[PDB]
Amino acid sequence: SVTCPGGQSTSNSQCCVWFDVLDDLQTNFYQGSKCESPVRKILRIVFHDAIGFSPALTAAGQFGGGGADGSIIAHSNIELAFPANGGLTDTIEALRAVGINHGVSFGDLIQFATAVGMSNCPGSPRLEFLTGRSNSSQPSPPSLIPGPGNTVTAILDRMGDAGFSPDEVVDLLAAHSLASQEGLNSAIFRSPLDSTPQVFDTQFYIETLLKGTTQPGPSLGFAEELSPFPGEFRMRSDALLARDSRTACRWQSMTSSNEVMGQRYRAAMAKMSVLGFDRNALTDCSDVIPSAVSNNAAPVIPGGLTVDDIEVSCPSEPFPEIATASGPLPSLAPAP
Ligand code: HEM
Ligand SMILES: *[C@@H]1O[C@H](CO)[C@@H](O[C@@H]2O[C@H](CO)[C@@H](O)[C@H](O)[C@H]2NC(C)=O)[C@H](O)[C@H]1NC(C)=O
Ligand SMILES: [C-]#N
C-alpha cells in the first residue's frame, strides 16, 4: 500500500514529496531542527499570508484577497512594502528557493513550514497539514493585517471579517508564546514577549496580565507598553486584548492549561490555513508532521510575583490557582 520511496507509510501519494521538503527544511532553514528565529518569522508569515482575505471587500465588488495562497512570496515585491511586513525579506527568499526546488505551491509550503517549525518547539501540538492549494495568486489588498497600535474594536472587526470570533482571536495569539520583536524597539532587539520564547506554553497569557512595571529599553518603541520585568517586551494590542471585556475571560482561561491552549490553537490554525479555500478539495498529509518533545513544566507566575500582581480582568471567573516561583525578578535574554 502507499509507501513513499524512503519507506515511510502515508495515506496518499500526494504526501510523498513532503518527506523531501521536510528534510531540507529541518537541515537548512531550521539549522538542524532548532526552534529559533526562522520558526518565529514563519509564524508571522503564515498569519500575514492567510489574513489577506476580506469577504467585505468582495461584497463591495473589490478583490478581497486569496487568503492562504502564498501571495506574500509570489507577490513579495508589493506585499513586503506593507507596514506590517518588515523584517521578513530574508525568510521569504529562503522559502522561495525551497518551493521552486521541490515544485510545491507557495501556499502549501508556508502551511507546511509552519507545522514543521512548530514541531521543533517543546510543548507544541501537531498541526493539521493539507496539500493542494493552487500556486496561482493575486497580490493581497493593503490594510488587511492588524497592527499593534490598533484598538481592540479595530482588531476584532478585521479578524471577524476574515471569519474569526473574539475567542478565536485570543486562541490564535498563543503564537506569541514563541515570540520576540525586532522592529518595534530595535534598541532591545529580539526582546521576548514571554519568558520562554522557545517553549509553546501558557506563560504569554500569564505575563501579559501582570502589572506593567518596567521599561526594558532606553526609550519606548512603537506601540510599546511597560512590561513586568527586565528584557521582556509588551506590545499595546496584547496588553489591551488581555484586559478588554470582550476578550478577557478567554485570555484568563488560557493561563492554566497547556493542554487546553494547544487544542484551541490547533483548531484556530486549521481554520486559518484554509482561508480562501475549500478544505474538502485538499488532501490530508498530517501524518508527515513529526511529534514535538513534550513540555513537562507547569505554568508559573515568575520571579516572586503573586496573584496580587496580575490585573484580573475577567469579572465572572476567579483567576486560576497557578504556582509562584521563589526568586528575584527575571531579566530575559534576547530570544535566539
Ligand atoms: C491579533 C493581532 C496581532 C498583532 C497586532 C501582532 C503583532 C505583532 C508584532 C508587531 C510583532 C513584532 C514583530 C517585530 O517587530 O519583529 C509580532 C511578533 C510575532 N507575532 Fe504577532 N501579532 C498578532 C497576531 C499574531 C498571530 C495570530 C500569529 C500567528 C499565528 C502571530 C505570531 C507572531 C510571532 C511568532 C511573532 C514573533 C516574531 C519574531 O520573534 O521574530 N502574531 N506580532
Ligand atoms: C509558483 O508560481 C511562481 C510564480 O508566481 C513560480 O515562481 C517562479 O519560478 C521560476 C522558476 O520556475 C523562478 O525563476 C521565478 O523567479 C519564480 N518567481 C517568483 C516570484 O518566485 C513557481 O515556480 C511556481 N511553482 C510551481 C510549482 O508552479
Ligand atoms: C504577528 N504578526
Ligand SMILES: [Ca+2]
Ligand atoms: Ca495571501
Ligand SMILES: [Ca+2]
Ligand atoms: Ca512561551
